[PDB]
Amino acid sequence: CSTPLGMENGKIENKQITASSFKKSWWGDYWEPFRARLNAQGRVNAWQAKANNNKQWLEIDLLKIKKITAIITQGCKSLSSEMYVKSYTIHYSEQGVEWKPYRLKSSMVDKIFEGNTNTKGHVKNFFNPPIISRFIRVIPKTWNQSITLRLELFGCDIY
């Protein structure tokens, strides 16, 4: 139960990824949410929030309930800009309407995950207990320059 869920290989389609917002690029197009795919190359190769505040989020709808065991976040360098999410929290939901924050057994507080320190390195965090649900949201808490992401999810089908 540790196989990538499809962010970088395309199994997870563009329609399954949404966000609170997303910036317009110098090229006119957008740093769309579905571009936040691991190791993506190109002019606009990541998700970039339109506004840098602690009220943003990237949502991945897996379509069915799955078992998620890990996540990898990556940053993004565009022109002279070096951006990456330094830390974040995770929220999940079975229906997509009510959200539950991820926290460790006996946490009265939200679990803050350690993110990136550069724009290319991969930082992998494991979930224990694992998250079993359909929708997952990455909530950036701190970042460098701008909130930019590229990620991958790991887990497996349930039964």
Side-chain angles (χ1 to χ4, degrees), residues 111-128:
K111 217 282 211 50
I112 286 176
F113 297 87
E114 294 298 321
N116 302 100
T117 72
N118 55 40
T119 76
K120 180 59 185 177
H122 286 2
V123 172
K124 191 184 220 178
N125 283 139
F126 296 82
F127 295 125
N128 273 132

Side-chain angles (χ1 to χ4, degrees), residues 91-147:
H91 286 200
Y92 52 100
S93 181
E94 276 179 359
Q95 290 186 315
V97 191
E98 299 295 273
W99 298 86
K100 214 65 186 171
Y102 183 79
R103 8 181 106 154
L104 299 184
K105 138 220 77 198
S106 105
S107 32
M108 167 120 298
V109 174
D110 280 0
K111 217 282 211 50
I112 286 176
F113 297 87
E114 294 298 321
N116 302 100
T117 72
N118 55 40
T119 76
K120 180 59 185 177
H122 286 2
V123 172
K124 191 184 220 178
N125 283 139
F126 296 82
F127 295 125
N128 273 132
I131 276 151
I132 305 179
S133 62
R134 186 193 149 151
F135 293 85
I136 187 106
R137 286 193 166 181
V138 185
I139 284 102
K141 289 285 157 216
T142 72
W143 45 88
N144 183 77
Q145 295 208 208
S146 236
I147 284 161

Side-chain angles (χ1 to χ4, degrees), residues 2 18 29 33 35 47 67 85 126 129 134 150 157 159:
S2 59
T18 71
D29 47 5
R35 302 225 219 239
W47 163 54
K67 189 187 168 159
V85 171
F126 296 82
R134 186 193 149 151
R150 265 187 298 174
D157 275 324
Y159 53 76

